[PDB]
Design a protein around this ligand. Structure first.
Ligand SMILES: [Ca+2]
Ligand SMILES: [Ca+2]
Ligand SMILES: [Ca+2]
Ligand SMILES: [Ca+2]
Ligand SMILES: [Ca+2]
Ligand SMILES: [Ca+2]
Ligand SMILES: [Ca+2]
Ligand SMILES: [Ca+2]
Ligand SMILES: [Zn+2]
Lengths: 463, 97
């Protein structure tokens, strides 16, 4: 940001805003994704591929009657799962099977199984809303959920609410995840103040006890917060460390958000009021984060492992480590769209947007309004791999090169003279195509090219 | 998993104060529909903006501003007591009246 434009500083602030590792957050060590995955799996508990086929294949049963010796355990009155609990639990199990090489198929324990799981309710708690057992326990596979006439949260699980996250969370225990810290409901009065690392909040893992607001994330919209229904960034990394990434999931072209083709309730948005909280896992194909239906100002990052501010919330959308997402569509707000190393299609939509294509040849649509196309390295847009600004509006849009020039300007010339920063602006009427060629290295030839659909003028360039 | 308190369970009369200034307390009613009584204006001095709704979290409570999104978080410290930070690093205490 030193010696650069405000627009570049905005992009650069946002790309670094959620950086992790090698510093302190809230007085605690900042953990990277990989460090948090280590802590989430610190028990060392796992299932094992007993039948040797590369996959943890598990059975599960909703208990219809108290299992043998239930009264021994002192859990109060037993309950079978309601229809709603079954449906939502199936969705939670699906969201784990989506990301890691584990399968959940309902049925009794069978000879082919790597293990068996059980689901039922209890009525008497000593503090916890639910509990489960790690896969090295004698009760491996069991999870239990509290329902009495002073706690009905678990009777009404649904997308975005705490009942559904609790199912995802306790299933996470049965898979081998711990709480990010050594704490448990009903044992003392645990606090985020004593967390092991800064990113132990509900913005990073459904296993955390601690509100995302502790790390600054705003998940509140229209007077109320929400809870991720599906595994978050660190959860995905942890369960994948245990059992391996499921590359088969959504391996074709996928849209997330509005117009979602992901076929998951937590990946789908259908109105500007929606509270989206998710972490994208995707196995391949040419994919799009479509946030066109929101009117709020948004900040969208296509970097793997990175966070985005979506739908008027902050830090609520992420892309899992090891996932390449190619395209992004802003809304009618004033947005930030940040690409990655792949060829990206970025569409700002209405409002004044700032677009950063990054590496490779990107196709950048500003949309209506006054949009700024930000360049940080020469390799962002080379003569052999050049961005096209697909709807460039001269006199309104801007091309910003100050991340490269540090505001030392350009030398606009008819033909390169052999000096760094020489720039040649051309227009081809038959293609309605502008060209900006720059010789940033000073070798007498272009080492930088942006193509524009629509003429581009010297006064359209910030450098 | 923490037990999430219902709005009906949180509702009632609450006293707010900043530690080191215990003599400047606010008493405010939190209503089951997640609004406040008019005395919530008393919090304006510490928070700048006045909250208009509240929402329980499993580990604490959010006081949410009029735009429906901006918030102050307070962590549940013990039964009937939440704490949060205001005015830099001052400690705001919210305790059952
Ligand atoms: Ca197996
Ligand atoms: Ca895909
Ligand atoms: Ca892809
Ligand atoms: Ca926009
Ligand atoms: Ca790119
Ligand atoms: Ca625009
Ligand atoms: Ca435009
Ligand atoms: Ca590029
Ligand atoms: Zn737990």
């Amino acid at each position: 940001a030193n010696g650069t434009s405000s627009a570049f500083t905005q992009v650069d602030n946002f790309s670094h805003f959620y950086d992790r590792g090698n510093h302190l957050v809230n007085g605690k060590p900042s953990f990277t994704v990989d460090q948090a995955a280590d802590q989430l799996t610190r028990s060392g508990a796992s299932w094992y591929d007993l039948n040797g086929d590369g996959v943890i294949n598990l059975s599960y049963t909703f208990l219809t009657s108290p299992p043998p010796g239930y009264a021994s355990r002192g859990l109060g009155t037993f309950s079978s799962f309601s229809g709603l609990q079954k449906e939502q639990a199936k969705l939670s199990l699906e969201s784990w099977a989506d990301v890691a090489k584990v399968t959940f198929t309902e049925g009794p324990a069978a000879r082919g199984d790597d293990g068996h799981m059980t689901f039922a309710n209890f009525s008497a708690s000593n503090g916890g809303a639910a509990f489960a057992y790690l896969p090295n326990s004698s009760r491996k596979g069991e999870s239990w959920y509290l329902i009495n006439k002073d706690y009905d949260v678990n009777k009404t699980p649904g997308e975005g609410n705490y009942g559904r996250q609790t199912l995802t969370h306790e299933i996470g225990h049965t898979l081998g995840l711990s709480h990010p810290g050594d704490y448990n409901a009903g044992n003392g009065n645990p606090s985020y103040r004593d967390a092991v690392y800064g990113e132990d909040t509900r913005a990073y893992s459904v296993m955390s006890y601690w509100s995302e607001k502790n790390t600054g994330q705003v998940f509140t919209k229209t007077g109320e917060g929400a809870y991720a229904s599906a595994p978050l960034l660190d959860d995905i990394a942890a369960v994948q460390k245990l059992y391996g990434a499921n590359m088969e999931t959504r391996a074709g072209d996928t849209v997330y958000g509005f117009n979602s083709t992901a076929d998951r309730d937590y990946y789908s948005a259908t109105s500007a009021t929606d509270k989206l909280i998710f972490s994208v896992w995707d196995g391949g194909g040419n994919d799009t984060l479509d946030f066109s239906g929101f009117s709020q100002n948004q900040k969208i990052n296509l970097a793997a492992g990175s966070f985005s501010d979506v739908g008027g919330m902050t830090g609520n959308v992420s892309i899992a480590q090891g996932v390449t997402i190619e395209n992004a569509i802003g809304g009618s707000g004033n947005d930030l769209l940040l690409g990655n190393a792949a060829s990206n299609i970025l569409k700002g939509g209405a409002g004044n947007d700032i677009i950063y294509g990054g590496g490779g040849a990107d196709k950048l649509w500003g949309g209506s309004g006054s949009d700024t196309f930000v360049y940080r390295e020469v390799s962002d847009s080379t003569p052999k791999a050049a961005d096209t600004l697909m709807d460039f509006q001269t006199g309104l849009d801007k091309i910003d090169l100050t991340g490269i020039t540090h505001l030392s300007g350009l030398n606009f010339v008819n033909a390169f003279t052999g000096q760094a920063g020489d720039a040649v602006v051309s227009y081809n009427q038959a293609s309605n195509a502008g060209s900006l060629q720059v010789d940033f290295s000073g070798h007498g030839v272009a080492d930088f090219l942006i193509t524009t659909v629509g003429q581009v003028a010297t006064y359209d360039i910030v450098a | 998993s923490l037990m999430l308190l219902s709005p009906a369970q949180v509702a009632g009369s609450w006293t707010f104060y900043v530690q080191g200034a215990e003599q400047d307390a606010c008493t405010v009613t939190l209503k089951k529909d997640r609004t406040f009584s008019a005395q919530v204006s008393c919090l304006q001095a510490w928070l700048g903006r006045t909250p208009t709704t509240w929402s329980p979290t499993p580990d604490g409570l959010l006081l949410i501003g009029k735009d429906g999104s901006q918030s102050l978080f307070l962590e549940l410290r013990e039964a009937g007591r939440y704490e949060g930070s205001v005015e830099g690093s001052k400690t705001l205490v919210m305790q059952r009246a």
